[PDB]
């Protein structure tokens, strides 16, 4: 173990790569982070040498995940929403996802309306397919009867249970609001 | 009078200006030495990245408020506020400035913009804010150094840390260069220089300059100078780093 | 926020009466809105409404150093807020063609005018003279501004009243209102102004605009005058191209009204001091 | 899911953190840490920073007080202490904190201005107070109070004299004298949750989630300078006398510690 | 702004000696100097350097001079850097370089050996001269910082004046005294009003005169403020860019030898003008 | 907290608690009411009201007869509306709430891409909502579920648009108001009431029309003098 | 070194040295054209009240029943055949926004800059990503006008290989009203390079290869044999445009062939300047007639 | 010092009706789109216009119906003899540039220009009276430059009244006098004012007599200025071919 600045050289590109968060000059690499270094080994025998700061160290929604988030925004088209946990493990930095229209249900019906799958104010959990080019916006959907909404407050200010596919209610009192419940 | 802060008086005169003595000047020294530097990165919590340096009576904090979204035209931006304390110097100016601030944050931006690396920070403005609590003596480097230990803590990418360093002229019949000088050495002087490099890769990324008279060759050995106090100086901030990634693998 | 746009409906309709010179309430051109001036109980205060048009007036005094070119006479600050509730629009540090203006506009208005006396307030020639400021308000938006601070400024600075001081060489003495009474100002001739609406290019003229007829002109004429007949001021805005004979008629309508407003402001003056001396601390006038 | 995590907490008659809903955390102060100032206080609260610097200086009085020495504070919540907070002018939070603290100056009556007049009607002096928050974690009233009476008993002030043939007033840098000052004024702060639950010294998120905010100073002779009371869901006086009691028991301890310091010097 | 292949052009050519306009590394362009354009100014002065026009203005006020130094007066510095320039400047887009190029001005003159305030001051602690220069912006072709400075030290030249006896009296009541003899004004020695020197660096060779199309294309550019003698006044440098510590020495070394000759052209010059006389015409913006 | 019953004609303030009788049978809350548990919070003054379905089981409705000024996109309601842009396919218009509602090219009587509507920026329209919610900007439309714009689509021209108050309208459209029937009778007219406060109206000349606005703004409280001073004023035009 | 000041000297205007008294019809604004039986109005005049009034400075030209106005600085108006040079400023989803001295901001859509070579099946996602990495923003384009919408703004494509993105090179920016409209703007000068002359005011000056579009950037460096000749054309262009006068290819070869004597710096200075661009004029003057 | 002597002669020389010879150019600055530079007397204008071009950060402004119209004013510190600070942002300087974008916009015939900013910039390095109408003209030889469309000669100028008469093209000394001066700017084709600016007292039917005054000096401006002109445009030509 050993901890690393932003100017000390590690070693000859004929010792190793750069994998991250270095760079190279004439005949050296050097790194760029205050942190620890590591030197991975491939099968091939030649290291890749790459420095982290491991207070947020690295993580990747990657297409087959199962991650949630927040409804902020919606509209008649799509709907935005903050990432909160992806997986189990949350991450402060709060990436920012949309739903789409028809990106809804597995049965991908032109019949689905918003307004009555999703509400601002509400977890859900999706499954997203583009990281996005400029703005990295996530594409999530939820194309699945486990999916969707599974905590939503009522309402005012009661939580409510998912009944059945498209109804919750809330204990305390009875009103049925319209969701893409999951499961 | 301005209307965001407190109704006070329209003008205010210090005392000093009413005093009758001749100050005590400083005397002799050893020229080439430097003054005793505590520096430590991540004394603040709310920010991703501060640092702290004190040598003398400076006393400098400087905080990295992180990427906030706002080729080369798809280049990173940092935008540094440089601000002396109301209680630091003989006498008071409003929070404000508009004289001496701006310089000294033009200074910092040219300093920093060549250490830091903006390639890898798109589309993102780093808000640097560096602030005087006391001046003591060299402040612009100082400044440089805190941003560059900030910067280096936050995890902002780089080419090589900055090290300043102050330098000024004794007015004597043999003028000599005076090395890390007090804010007495510093408005007894007839000039005043600052430097900044990166060492590693021996490279100045902004100085600067001033003189009640001077020449080439003495302006020359000046710099020069300077680039070996920073050289001795750069250790002590490397170990500083070291130390607070060695306290954040501690809490986790 | 914004205001709402305006319809084309709305526009070619009033267009259209205007050609057939008839207004939307039911006067004529030449005529302004039932104007009330109220006052307040302190000495400088004066809500002037114009149909729904309401503006606020104070007046205000002070002792201060005088600026050195001239040390003999006073100071003067006059100022024009457009307060929010005016209307949406007239958000903070967004509307600021138009306070300009306005307020340009009226410091020429009364200040170069010469309407008060800014020598007879002067106390000690060259350390301490009075500053009368005037801070107008802007409460309801509809239509004319210009009449109505104006009006509002005139009613106040003739309806203020000083704090008397005594003086023996450089020995100044001021004194509160329950000691002695305060000593009012000294004007010369209350100016007002006047405004004229210009539609299609100049054809037709029209006075104190709605806000609607505001929205749907090209030009405005401002003129201001006396009760002796004395242009103070006149301002064309709106990039409009008008003639001679135009300002002249103008100026003979401007004439009358202000032969009239100046009459009913005497009377509100009048009726004020009137309840005063027999018990209240209000007084109102209705055109 | 903020909210339910932290009432889970509340209920369980503690906090996040590790404190039992009515104490607060590591306080501490550090005096005379700066020369160029004539006072200098730093406090701090955990993770909570304040900083106080206070200048001296001559001024000329009004006329209707001319023995009135001016004091005049100023609060900076600079960007580096919170994200919050742009590089700019003073935003809300900044004046509003100034406008507390100056009704605390001019209320509690720590200093007499008449304690500040050298030749009345000619000279007095202005006492620039300025505060600067380095870290809003949360409850920076309390903290920027504590550093501005600290520092304000940290000043040590010259002597000045009159001379007629000249007519011009001349300084002693070298003999000083310290600043009376009669009350000792110390801020308490709460938070008031839903109806009932009020946490002390509430943090960040604490204040950020809450249905409103209480302030209480409160002198050492039983008495209280100001009960800051912005917006909240409501309190009766049963809510309100165990605040005072607690603000009480807060004076003490704060009270204490100053003194050891300004007597570990 | 310019792509990266027209950088490329340019570069090379510095490497190699040649320059779109056909010159060297140390060859400034012809500058037009004026002085006496306004009227109303007690000095003025107006240069056109290829395609950068700027004026000044110098006013020659009373004040009360500063309770540091009473034995002397002071400069003061404002820079008007008109949207005429470049219209991305407003009014407030331009504060930005304005209080740069003012701040500069300053330092040039922190110097308390080039302008002798001395003969500046009437009566200490009472009464002083105080010169307001007022720069003001018209085109921006580049080398800005040398034209600007050679009109101040144009200006300045051209500075007259007048003499005043302030005389004090009892009970508070000052008088001033004129001397009829608009002929009969002072005058201020330039001998050390210094010239900045602006070496940008492009490639591995350093340059003056670098006009805008090579500042872009350039990292690094070392102001350098000299008066006639030699000496170097102020050291500044600008630039979004490193700077390797040998090359400062080059760079000293020849915005000494550019300031040498730059002194001695505008010297002999303003002689020149100064004996024509009135016989000139004064031709400006017609 | 007491006698639901008992004030259906008194005033009403917010904060009230009322609470209505009893196994039970369904009501609705009004627009101005708002439910507390089994209870009904009052949000706005007003005289209240109540109303029972010709049958008896619907239980009942009750609410709150507010006036007021600032109108909120609600769903089924007639509304007028002024187009303040377009984008691409769909053009805003705006109604007078907090943020401008939407159309579509093909929602009027008959349209298709080789078929659009003549709507110009500033022209005014005669809509009815289809998504009015507070978290969702309201969607409006000119045309009837069935396919046929019963009196829907652009207004047209040569009329005066002015605002009254809301309570004004929910007045005037009454079947028992004696103002708009003995207008018929002076002089004819055609005019689109909106529930936004904003009324249209047209007639032969423009005197009248100008008689008839300010009557209309002025009905709420106009006294019999000048009832029958502007009624012979336009048995005078 | 060489360092040089000199006062400035008064104009001498009215062009004497010419003596030509022109067979024009020169107007201004407020001047009353011919007024007649149903006479077209063009760009630079307009009507009120039944009189055709001017509105922009210059000569008036009656075409066989048009009357139109030429005035003498003016930004480029869009043709439709017109070649054109480029300087890009933006690059949005669709296409790429490019700045020419015209009075809006022109336009290239994705759909029109050719491919490399000519691999062309159609555009996709993948193009519309490689929008930015092959023409980067700042970047100069030598293209055609395909069309001029309504609203003003030029569309502009790329017929051929001939045309595309630049290489090197140097630029210029002059007036567009000093530019002969004629036929092959693209020249290749014996002089040892190459020009494009815009019918805006964007001149290119290009060394000429040997092999004889812009998918390379042969970035290499240039004889100085052949970076004086540019140099000089760069100046030698400048001083034509500082005197008013026309602008194609015996102009610049011939204050070329007169600028040799005088060294490749010397002649900016208004002396020298003046003295070549007389016998360019004169010369082209009398051997043309 | 006086203003009228009793023969009719004022100060500088010069009768009632008369005016100071204005001194112009047009091309002063060629990195623009078009330039000027006049002086009416002592005055100095400086006039730019930067052409119908693009807007930016476009914050919804850009009209498509006609062209936008943002001119600037600015007064020189040095200017007066009195040195003066923030010429820009003054309550003033924004007055005169509402005042020119109300003329300009009235004249520069904007509905050919749709989506596109005239910015049009006005210096004034010297003030000896008649400043408003010194920017006028120069704004409008630089439009005229810049061969921007306009329907007329915009041309400006002041009148005043001393000892019941009428005085052309006032200076700074009557105007410090505080008699009535009214500053107007015509269109000479038509007769039609574009602007008609006034800041004293006097009577009414003295109105007349000031008015047609400052309109025939107005007419003499337009006579020198469209001299200039020809005489700018013949030159062109001639070197042209």
Avoid at chain 2, 55 to 76: D, E, F
Avoid at chain 4, 26 to 53: E, F, Q, R
């Amino acid at each position: 173990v050993r901890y690393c600045i932003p100017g000390e050289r590690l070693c000859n590109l004929e010792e190793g790569s750069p994998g991250s968060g270095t760079y190279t000059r004439h005949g050296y690499i050097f790194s760029s982070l205050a942190g620890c270094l590591m030197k991975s080994s491939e099968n091939g025998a030649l290291p890749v040498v790459s420095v982290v700061r491991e207070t947020e160290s690295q993580l990747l929604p990657d297409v087959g995940a199962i991650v949630t988030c927040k409804v902020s925004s919606i509209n008649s088209r799509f709907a935005k929403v903050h990432i909160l946990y992806v997986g189990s493990m949350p991450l402060k930095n709060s990436f920012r996802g949309t739903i789409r229209k028809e990106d809804v249900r597995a049965t991908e019906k032109d019949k689905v309306e918003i307004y009555k799958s999703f509400r601002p104010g509400d977890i859900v959990l999706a499954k997203v397919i583009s990281l996005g080019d400029a703005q990295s916006n996530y594409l999530l959907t939820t194309a699945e009867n486990e999916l969707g909404v599974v905590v939503a407050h009522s309402e005012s200010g009661i939580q409510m249970v998912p009944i059945s596919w498209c109804e919750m209610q809330c204990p305390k009192t009875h009103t049925k609001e319209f969701r893409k419940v999951a499961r | 009078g301005d209307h965001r802060r407190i109704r006070g008086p329209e003008e205010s005169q210090p005392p000093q200006l009413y005093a009758a003595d001749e100050e005590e000047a400083p005397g002799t020294r050893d020229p080439t030495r430097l003054r005793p530097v505590y520096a430590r990165a991540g004394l603040l919590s709310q920010a991703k990245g501060s640092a702290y340096l004190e040598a003398g009576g400076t006393k400098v904090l400087c905080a990295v408020s992180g990427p906030r979204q706002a080729p080369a035209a798809l280049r990173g931006r940092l935008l540094c506020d440089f601000r002396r304390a109301p209680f630091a110097g003989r006498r008071r100016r409003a929070p404000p400035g508009g004289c001496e601030e701006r310089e000294l944050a033009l200074a910092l931006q040219e300093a920093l913009e060549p250490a830091v690396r903006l390639g890898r920070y798109p589309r993102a403005q780093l808000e640097v804010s560096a602030l005087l609590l006391e001046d003591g003596g060299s402040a612009l480097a100082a400044a440089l150094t805190a941003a560059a230990l900030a910067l280096a803590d936050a995890g902002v990418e780089m080419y090589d840390l900055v090290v300043g360093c102050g330098l000024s002229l004794a007015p004597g019949p043999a003028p000599t260069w005076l090395l890390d000088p007090t804010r007495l050495e510093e408005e007894r002087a007839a000039a005043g220089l600052t430097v900044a490099l990166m060492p590693v890769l021996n490279q100045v990324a902004g100085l600067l300059g001033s003189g009640e008279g001077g020449l080439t060759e003495s302006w020359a050995e000046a710099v020069r100078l300077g680039l070996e106090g920073c050289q001795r100086l750069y250790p002590v901030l490397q170990q500083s780093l070291v130390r607070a990634a060695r306290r954040r693998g501690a809490a986790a | 926020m914004k205001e709402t746009p305006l319809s084309n409906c709305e526009r070619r309709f009033l267009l259209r009466a205007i050609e057939e010179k008839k207004r939307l309430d039911g006067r004529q051109t030449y005529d302004y809105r039932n104007i009330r001036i109220s006052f307040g109980t302190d000495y400088g205060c004066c809500i002037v409404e114009l149909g729904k048009t309401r503006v606020l007036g104070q007046v205000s005094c002070e002792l201060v150093s005088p600026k050195l070119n001239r040390a003999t006479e006073g100071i003067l600050f006059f100022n024009l807020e457009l307060s929010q509730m005016a209307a949406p629009a007239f958000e903070p540090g967004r509307q600021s063609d138009l306070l300009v203006k306005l307020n340009r506009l009226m410091e020429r208005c009364l200040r170069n005018s010469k309407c008060i006396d800014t020598e007879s307030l002067c106390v000690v020639a060259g350390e301490k003279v009075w500053q009368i400021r005037v801070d107008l308000h802007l409460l309801n938006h509809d239509g004319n501004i210009i009449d109505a601070a104006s009006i509002a400024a005139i009613v106040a600075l003739c309806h203020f009243r000083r704090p008397d001081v005594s003086v023996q060489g450089d020995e100044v003495t001021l004194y509160t209102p329950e000691e002695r009474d305060p000593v009012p100002l000294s004007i010369h001739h209350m100016p007002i102004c006047v405004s004229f609406a210009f539609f299609q290019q100049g054809t037709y003229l029209l006075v104190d605009p709605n806000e609607r007829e505001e929205r749907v002109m090209d030009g405005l004429l401002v003129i201001a005058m006396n009760k002796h007949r004395e242009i103070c001021t006149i301002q064309s805005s709106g990039g409009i191209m008008l003639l001679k004979d135009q300002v002249l008629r103008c100026s003979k309508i401007a004439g009358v009204k202000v032969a009239e407003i100046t009459e009913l402001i005497l009377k509100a003056l009048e009726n004020d001091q009137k309840v005063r001396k027999e018990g209240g601390k209000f007084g109102f006038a209705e055109s | 899911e903020p909210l339910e995590y932290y009432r889970r907490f509340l209920k369980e008659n503690c906090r996040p953190d590790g404190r039992e809903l009515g104490e607060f955390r590591t306080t501490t102060v550090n005096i005379g840490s700066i020369s160029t100032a004539d006072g200098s206080a730093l406090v701090k609260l955990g993770n909570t920073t304040v900083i106080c610097g206070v200048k001296a200086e001559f001024a000329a009085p009004s006329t209707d007080a001319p023995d009135k020495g001016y004091v005049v504070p100023n609060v900076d919540l600079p960007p580096l202490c919170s994200s919050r907070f742009r590089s700019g002018p003073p935003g809300e939070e900044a004046q509003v904190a100034s406008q507390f603290i100056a009704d605390v100056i001019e209320n509690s009556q720590i200093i007499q201005k008449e304690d500040l007049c050298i030749s009345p009607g000619k000279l007095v002096w202005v006492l620039y107070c300025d505060l600067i928050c380095l870290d809003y974690d949360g409850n920076i009233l309390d903290a920027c109070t504590f550093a501005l009476l600290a520092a304000l008993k940290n000043v040590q002030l010259p002597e000045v004299t009159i001379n007629e043939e000249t007519a011009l007033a001349e300084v002693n840098l070298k003999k000083k004298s310290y600043l009376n000052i009669r009350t000792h004024p110390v801020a308490t702060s709460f938070a008031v949750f839903d109806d009932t639950l009020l946490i002390v010294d509430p943090t960040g998120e604490e204040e950020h989630l809450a249905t409103g905010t209480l302030t209480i100073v409160m002198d050492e002779e039983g008495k209280l300078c100001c009960l800051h009371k912005p917006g909240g869901s409501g309190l009766t006086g049963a809510k309100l006398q165990d605040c005072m009691s607690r603000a009480v028991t807060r004076h003490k301890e704060v009270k204490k510690l100053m003194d050891e310091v300004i007597k570990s010097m | 702004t310019l792509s990266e292949a027209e950088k490329v052009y340019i570069v090379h050519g510095v490497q190699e000696d040649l320059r779109v306009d056909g010159r060297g590394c140390e060859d400034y362009r012809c500058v037009e100097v004026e002085t006496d354009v306004v009227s109303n100014t007690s000095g003025s002065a107006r240069v056109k350097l290829g395609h950068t026009d700027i004026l000044v203005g110098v006013k020659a006020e009373m004040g009360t001079p500063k309770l540091e130094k009473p034995n002397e007066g002071y400069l003061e510095f404002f820079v008007d850097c008109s949207a005429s320039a470049t219209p991305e400047f407003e009014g407030r887009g331009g504060d930005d370089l304005g209080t740069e190029i003012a701040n500069t001005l300053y330092r040039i003159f922190n110097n308390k050996s080039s302008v002798d305030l001395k003969t500046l001051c009437i009566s200490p602690r009472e009464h002083c001269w105080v010169l307001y220069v007022d720069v003001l912006l018209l085109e921006c072709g580049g080398n800005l910082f040398d034209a600007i400075s050679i009109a101040v030290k144009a200006a300045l030249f051209n500075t007259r004046i007048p003499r005043v006896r302030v005389l004090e009296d009892e009970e508070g009541s000052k008088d001033i005294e004129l001397s009829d003899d608009p002929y009969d004004c002072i005058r201020l020695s330039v001998e050390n009003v210094p010239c900045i020197v602006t070496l940008c660096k492009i490639g591995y060779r350093h340059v003056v005169d670098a006009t805008l199309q090579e500042e872009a294309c350039s990292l690094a550019s070392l102001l350098v403020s000299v008066t006639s003698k030699g000496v170097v006044t102020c050291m500044r440098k600008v630039g979004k860019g490193s700077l390797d510590p040998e090359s400062i020495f080059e760079m000293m070394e020849t915005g000494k030898r550019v300031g040498k000759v730059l002194h001695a052209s505008l010297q002999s010059v303003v002689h020149k003008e100064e004996s024509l006389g009135p016989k000139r015409q004064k031709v400006g913006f017609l | 907290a007491r006698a639901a019953r008992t004030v259906l004609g008194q005033v009403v303030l917010p904060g009230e608690e009322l609470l209505l009788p009893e196994s039970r049978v369904r009501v609705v809350c009004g627009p101005g009411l708002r439910r507390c548990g089994d209870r009904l919070l009052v949000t706005k003054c007003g005289r209240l009201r109540h109303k029972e379905p010709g049958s008896g089981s619907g239980g009942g409705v009750y609410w709150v007869d507010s006036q007021q000024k600032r109108y909120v996109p609600v769903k089924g309601d007639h509304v007028i509306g002024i187009v303040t842009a377009k984008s691409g396919d769909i053009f805003k218009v705006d109604v007078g709430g907090s943020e401008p509602a939407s159309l579509s090219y093909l929602s009027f009587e008959g349209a298709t891409k080789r078929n659009r509507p003549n709507v110009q920026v500033g022209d005014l329209i005669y809509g009815q909502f289809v998504v009015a919610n507070k978290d969702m900007e309201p969607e409006m439309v000119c045309i009837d579920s069935c396919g046929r714009a019963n009196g829907m689509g652009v207004i047209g021209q040569d009329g005066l648009l002015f605002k009254v108050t809301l309570g004004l309208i929910r007045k005037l459209l009454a079947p028992d108001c004696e103002i708009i029937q003995e207008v018929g009778k002076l002089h004819p007219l055609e005019i689109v009431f909106g529930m936004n406060g904003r009324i249209w109206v047209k007639a032969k000349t423009i005197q009248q029309t100008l008689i008839l606005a300010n009557i209309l703004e002025a009905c709420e409280h106009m006294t019999s003098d000048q009832r029958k001073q502007i009624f012979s004023r336009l048995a005078e035009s | 070194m060489a360092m040089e000041m000199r006062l400035p000297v008064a104009r001498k205007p009215l062009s004497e040295r010419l003596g030509r008294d022109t067979k024009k019809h020169l107007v201004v604004p407020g001047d009353t054209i011919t007024t007649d039986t149903g006479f077209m109005r063009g760009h630079g005049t307009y009507m009120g009240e039944e009189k055709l009034i001017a509105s922009v400075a210059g000569s008036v030209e009656r075409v066989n029943k048009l009357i139109c106005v030429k005035a003498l600085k003016t930004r480029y108006i869009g043709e439709v055949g017109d070649i054109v040079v480029g300087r890009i400023t933006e690059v949005q989803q669709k296409r790429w926004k490019v700045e020419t001295n015209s009075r809006l901001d022109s336009v290239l859509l994705l759909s029109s800059m050719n491919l490399p070579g000519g691999e062309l099946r159609r555009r996709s996602a993948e193009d519309e990503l490689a929008m930015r990495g092959f023409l980067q923003e700042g970047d100069l384009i030598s293209a055609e006008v395909q069309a001029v919408f309504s609203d003003g703004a030029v569309s502009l494509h790329t017929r051929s290989l001939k045309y595309g993105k630049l290489g090197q090179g140097v630029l210029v920016q002059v007036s567009p009203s000093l530019v002969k409209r004629q036929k092959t703007h693209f020249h290749d000068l014996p002089c040892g390079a190459s020009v494009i002359l815009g019918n805006n005011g964007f001149i290119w000056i290009y060394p000429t290869p040997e092999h004889k579009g812009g998918f390379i950037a042969n970035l290499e460096p240039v004889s100085l044999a052949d970076r004086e000749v540019i140099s000089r054309l760069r100046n030698c262009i400048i001083s034509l445009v500082t005197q008013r006068m026309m602008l194609y290819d015996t102009s610049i070869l011939y204050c070329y062939e007169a600028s040799l004597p005088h060294q490749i710096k010397d002649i900016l200075k208004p002396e020298i300047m003046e003295e070549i661009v007389m016998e360019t004029r004169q010369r082209l003057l009398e051997q043309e007639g | 010092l006086e203003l009228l002597s009793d023969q009719g002669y004022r100060v500088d020389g010069r009768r009632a009706g008369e005016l100071r010879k204005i001194q112009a150019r047009m091309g002063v600055f060629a990195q623009a789109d078009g330039s000027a530079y006049i002086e009416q007397g002592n005055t100095k204008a400086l006039a730019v216009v930067y052409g119908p071009h693009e807007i930016r950060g476009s914050r919804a402004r850009a009209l498509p119906d006609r062209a936008l119209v943002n001119c600037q004013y600015s007064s020189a510190t040095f200017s007066t003899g009195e040195r003066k600070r923030r010429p820009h942002g003054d309550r003033k300087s924004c007055e005169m540039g509402l005042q020119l974008r109300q003329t300009f916009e009235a004249a520069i015939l904007t509905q050919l220009h749709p989506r596109s900013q005239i910015d049009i910039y006005v210096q004034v390095l010297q003030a000896d009276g008649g400043t408003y109408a010194a920017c006028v003209n120069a704004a409008t030889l630089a439009v005229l430059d810049a061969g921007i469309p306009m329907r007329d000669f915009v041309c400006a100028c002041s009148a005043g009244f001393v000892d019941g008469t009428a005085l052309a093209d006032l200076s700074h000394v009557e105007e410090a006098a505080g008699g009535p001066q009214l500053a107007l700017a015509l269109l000479p084709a038509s007769g039609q004012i574009a602007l008609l600016e006034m800041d004293a007292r006097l009577h009414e039917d003295h109105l007349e007599r000031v008015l047609e005054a400052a309109a025939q000096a107005a007419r003499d401006v337009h006579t020198l200025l469209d001299r200039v002109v020809r005489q700018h445009v013949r030159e062109a030509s001639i070197l042209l071919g």
